């Protein structure tokens with residue numbers, strides 16, 4: 484009582500039910516380094532302007 | 541002559557104090573900026589001197605025709 488599969492059937496993506504737990508970290512990755520914190524705050528005008536040599540602004 | 545052409549000494553005195561304060565603040569700011577630049581270039585933990593790295597959004601996280609990638 485076997486029926487030969489038709490065209491396009493054996494190439495289907497099928498779901499499979501298993502009791503095997505999903506691996507937590509299959510890549511064996513380490514802890515990623517902490518990034519630079521942020522750029523937080525409100526922009527204020529430069530103190531005494533450019534401060535380049537003799538320029539006052 | 542003093543009344544027509546010149547002012548009192550208090551004006552020049554306090555203007556000199558204001559100028560001195562501004563210049564001293566500028567000097568301390570320049571030294572602080574130099575130190576901050578040195579530290580940021582040495583460590584790289586600050587906003588400055590952040591050289592680009594490869595964007596991780598380009599990585600394709602899909603099955604790769606081989607289980608071991």
Ligand SMILES: CCCCCCCCCCCCCCCCC[C@@H](O)O[C@H](CO[C@H](O)CCCCCCCCCCCCCCC)COP(=O)(O)OCC[N+](C)(C)C
Nearest residue numbers: 541542543544545546547548549550551552553554555556
């Ligand atoms: C009773 C007197 C007896 C003796 C007489 C003594 C003669 C002295 C006169 C000679 C004056 C010398 C020139 C020095 C002028 C100083 C310029 C400047 O420093 O003063 C300005 C003051 O402005 C004055 O009005 C200056 C006017 C003088 C202009 C000189 C021009 C003379 C040339 C005449 C040539 C003849 C013309 C005809 C051609 C045929 C400052 O501006 P300002 O920041 O606001 O004032 C600050 C002081 N305040 C606030 C207290 C007022």
